[PDB]
Amino acid sequence: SKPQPIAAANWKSSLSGLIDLFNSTSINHDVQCVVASTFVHLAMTKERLSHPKFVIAAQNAGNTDALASLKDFGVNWIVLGHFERRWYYGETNEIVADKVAAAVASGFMVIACIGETLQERESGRTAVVVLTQIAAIAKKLKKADWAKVVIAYEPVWAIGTGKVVTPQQAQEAHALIRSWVSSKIGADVAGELRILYGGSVNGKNARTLYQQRDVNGFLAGLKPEFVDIIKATQ
After folding, report:
1. Architecture of domain 1-234
2. CA dist 19 to 12, 33, 39, 90, 213, Å?
3. Which one of 91, 154, 172, 192 is the catalytic residue?
4. What is the residue extent of each domain of the chain?
5. Is 82 a catalytic residue?
């Protein structure tokens, strides 16, 4: 928890009132807040959201013209590799790596998601899946490019499964990720990198989760409690 933390929120499907709430939220400490949405709702979010610590993110780019369109529309952040895209639409490690590389090359700050399934965890293959995913990403980048990159660990194994995650487990995953980047990219890059927890999280357990080293913030859902999640990054 040393570099500047990030609190990001993903609005998947009213937004009006939530933007008001955030606009009137006071934030004493340094933290980069992010609001990701789908294309349909980028517009309302750009029109309405105005909080100094907040930027807008996109969720998906089909092609490179979409990246340029977004860039033109004044959107500089994007979220990629999120589970629904890997597991629902079969975006391979390589497809994601390319999107990330494309995004970075086009001037984006990228939040790149990784995470293993329940089968994968239960079979003991957390580290190989997670590290295989991030290795794919890295393969398409240079050391300099890591300045524009954020990692979000999604505990996919705790989605639709009734399972819950302990902070020890979240820490372990983040730690492992950090270790890889340190040893394969550089300790300096690893020190600056932000790895966010993208599992379900409320105000209460978010503070305790942020207390772990190696957790640098959250990828969460856009909801009223996001306010508490932001607060939890002191």
Report:
1. Alpha-Beta Barrel (3.20)
2. 15, 13, 17, 32, 30
3. 154
4. 1-234
5. yes
